[PDB]
Copies of this chain bind each other. A is one copy, B any other.
Amino acid sequence: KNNVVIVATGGTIAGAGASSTNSATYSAAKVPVDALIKAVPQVNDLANITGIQALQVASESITDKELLSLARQVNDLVKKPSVNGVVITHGTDTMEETAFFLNLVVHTDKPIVLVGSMRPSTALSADGPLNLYSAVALASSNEAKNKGVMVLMNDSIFAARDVTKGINIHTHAFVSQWGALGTLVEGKPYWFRSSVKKHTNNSEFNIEKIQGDALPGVQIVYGSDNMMPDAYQAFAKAGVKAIIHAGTGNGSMANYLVPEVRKLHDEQGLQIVRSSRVAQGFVLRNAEQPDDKYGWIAAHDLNPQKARLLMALALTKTNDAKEIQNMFWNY
C-alpha cells in the first residue's frame, strides 16, 4: 500500500486503435491514463494509484523535448515523500531509449519502471493488463530500490542499460545479452543479477542541471557495404556535434570513408563514436580502427540509439574524447 504513480506517455496499451483480433494494428494516441487504470482495476489491490498524463505521443516520434519533459516530470514526482514508486506507460518502439535516458539523468533510489504492450488494448490475448498490474507490484515493491531504471515486459524485470527490442510481433520482443535482473510472477519479484554500472544516484548527469529543451546534435549513420559519405556531410553541414557510426561488425569503417570521416572530425570538429549494427558483444576500442590515432570513441556495448543518447548527454559536460570514452565504459 505504497503510492505508485502511473505516468502515461501514450503507446499501444494506453491507446488501442483498431484490432479486436491481433497484434499488427499498433495504433495509439487513444486511451489516457484513467481509461487504463479503470480497465485493470486489480492494480488498485496492489497500491494507492494516481495517473498522470505526461504526453500522449506514439513512441517512434519522441524527440529530445519529450525526453527532457518526461525526465523532469519523473524527477519532480520522484522527489516527493509520498511517491514511493513510479510506473511509465510507453510505446514499445523507443521504450529502450526513455529508460536509458532516465537511468542516466534521474537522481533517485525509488523504482522507475517502464511498462508497455505488444498488442493493441483490444487484440485477443492482450499483454498490457498483466504487464500494467505486474509493473505496479514492483513499483510498489519495498525491495525495488537501487536497481536503476527497469523495464517490465513478459513478467521479466529488465535493467534499462541493455534492454532492447529484439523481436517484432511477439509478446516477448524485449531481450538483453546480459539478461534480466529477474522475473515478477504472481505479484512477487524474484532477483538473480544486479548491474555493475552507474545509474541514478551515482551518475554524472542530471535533468536538474540540464536546462535547454534540446541536447547537442548527435545523429546516427548506418553501416553496410557500398556506403557514401553523404549523410555524414549532410549532418556536419547541419551542425551536429557528433556522429554515431553504426559500423558493420566490430565498429567498422569502410576505407573509402576513413579519409572523409577523419576530416569531418579534424576540420569541422565532429565527434566520432564507433558503434555497431551487431546487437551483442561490444566494440573494443583500438581494435578495428585506431581511435587513439584518430581521436575517436569505442561505444562499448550500447546499440546506436543508446550510444546516441550518451553522447548527447556527454557533450553537455565535455568535448574531451577520453573522458567520454570513459563514460561509455561505465554506464
* Interface size, A (range): 35 or more
* Interface-facing stretch out of A205-213, A225-233, A265-273, A318-326: A225-233
Which B residues are CB-close (under 8 A) to A250?
A: 26, 93, 168-169
Identify A19's interface contact among B186, B219, B254, B281, CB under 8 A: B186
* Interface-facing stretch out of A76-84, A107-115, A118-126: A118-126
Task: Give the oligomeric copy count.
Answer: 4
Asked if A177 is at the interface of the complex by the 8 Å CB criterion, the answer is: yes
Q: Is the CB of B276 within 8 A of A168?
A: yes
Asked if A283 is at the interface of the complex by the 8 Å CB criterion, the answer is: yes
Task: Give the interface SS of chain A, mostly helix, strand, loop or mixed.
Answer: loop
Asked if A280 is at the interface of the complex by the 8 Å CB criterion, the answer is: yes
Identify A129's interface contact among B62, B125, B166, B282, CB under 8 A: B125
Chain A 120-147, CB within 8 Å of chain B: the 1/0 string? 0001111111110110000000000000
Chain A 270-288, CB within 8 Å of chain B: the 1/0 string? 0000001111111110011
Chain B residue nearest in CB terms to A223 = B60
Given contacts A125-B129, A178-B179, A284-B24, contact A226 B191 (CB under 8 A): no
Asked if A35 is at the interface of the complex by the 8 Å CB criterion, the answer is: no
Nearest CB on B from A136, distance (A):
11
Which B residues are CB-close (under 8 A) to A128?
A: 125
Q: Is the CB of A21 within 8 A of B238?
A: no
Asked if A291 is at the interface of the complex by the 8 Å CB criterion, the answer is: no
Given contacts A67-B225, A125-B131, contact A172 B154 (CB under 8 A): yes
Interface hits, A145-204 → B, CB 8 Å: 154-156, 162, 165-173, 176-180, 182-183, 185-187, 190-197
Asked if A51 is at the interface of the complex by the 8 Å CB criterion, the answer is: no
Given contacts A221-B222, A230-B231, contact A21 B133 (CB under 8 A): yes
Which B residues are CB-close (under 8 A) to A301?
A: 192
CA distance A165 to B249 in the complex (A): 7
Given contacts A185-B169, A287-B24, contact A234 B224 (CB under 8 A): no
CA distance A92 to B59 in the complex (A): 34
Nearest CB on B from A212, distance (A):
13
Nearest CB on B from A229, distance (A):
9
Q: Is the CB of A278 within 8 A of B166?
A: yes
Q: Is the CB of B168 within 8 A of A171?
A: no
Instruction: Point out residues on A near B: beta carbons under 8 Å.
Output: 19-26, 40, 42, 58-64, 67, 92-94, 97, 119, 123-131, 133-134, 154-156, 162, 165-173, 176-180, 182-183, 185-187, 190-197, 219-228, 230-231, 233-235, 238, 246-250, 252-256, 276-284, 287-288, 301, 304-305, 308
